[PDB]
């Protein structure tokens, strides 16, 4: 049931540009087509002004159509941290044996969904309160692969994060 598709979950405004755009280029080059889910259908705009269109509402996501979900951070992500829909997607993908990945502030959604309890992760330095509150173990690394869970510590690690996600996906058929 491999699809060669990756889903992003991110805020429609003020998502972290580098985390999205730099990972997208790597995912595409590797043969993984990407879609964006958010809170409305239309044009999203990053913190730094970069635009992209939102393909899907969270409510329209079907896990069977994707191999992985990627939670993108940025200051706009804070609006999604306590949202039952984004947490619900984290759990949905985990329970369906998909890859669940987050970068920067996106990791907090995963922590709040209780999918990082006793799991080794990394995260944005500023967010370590939330991540530790979710019982995760914070590792001194830019990117951490823990089975099907992949985390990274923010925009400075966007390319390393994407490469790590591709590595996990390419080991699947």
Enumerate the known binding-site residues for Mg(2+).
Answer: 133
Query: In this chain, which stretch among 10-18, 49-57, 70-78, 109-117 interacts with Cl ion, using CB under 5 A?
Result: 49-57
Shortest distance in whole angstroms from residue 88 CB to Cl ion: 10
Using the rule CB under 5 A, is 59 a contact of Cl ion?
yes
Instruction: Transcribe 95-152 into DSSP letters.
Output: HTT-EEEEETTHHHHHHHTT--TT-EE---GGGHHHHHHTTPEEPSSSEEEETTEEEE
149 forms bridges with which residues in the sheet?
100, 146
Burial degree of 99 (CB within 10 A; 0-12, 13-18, 19+): buried
Judged by CB under 5 A, the chain residues 128 through 167 that form the site for Cl ion are none
Minimum Å gap between C-beta 115 and Cl ion is: 20
Per-residue tokens: 137: 């173990």
Q: What's the closest the beta carbon of residue 161 comes to Cl ion, in angstroms? A: 25
- Is 58 a binding residue for Cl ion by CB under 5 A? The answer is yes
21 near Cl ion, rule: CB under 5 A = no
Residues making contact with Cl ion (CB under 5 A): 57-59
């Amino acid at each position: 049931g491999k699809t060669n598709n990756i889903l992003y979950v991110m805020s429609g405004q003020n998502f972290q540009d580098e985390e999205y755009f730099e990972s997208k280029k790597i995912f595409e080059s590797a043969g993984y087509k990407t879609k964006v889910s958010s809170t409305f259908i239309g044009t999203a705009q990053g913190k730094l002004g970069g635009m992209t269109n939102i393909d899907l509402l969270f409510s329209e996501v079907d896990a069977v159509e994707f191999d992985a979900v990627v939670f993108v951070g940025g200051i706009g992500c804070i609006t999604l941290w306590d949202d039952w829909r984004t947490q619900g997607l984290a759990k949905l993908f985990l329970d369906n044996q998909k890859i669940v990945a987050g970068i920067g502030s996106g990791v907090v959604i995963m922590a709040n969904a209780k999918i990082l309890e006793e799991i080794n992760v990394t995260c944005l330095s500023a967010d370590e309160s939330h991540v530790r509150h979710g019982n995760a173990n914070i590792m001194s690394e830019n990117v951490v692969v823990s089975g099907n869970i992949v985390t990274a510590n923010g925009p400075t690690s966007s390319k390393d994060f994407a490469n790590a996600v591709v590595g996990v996906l390419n080991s699947l058929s």
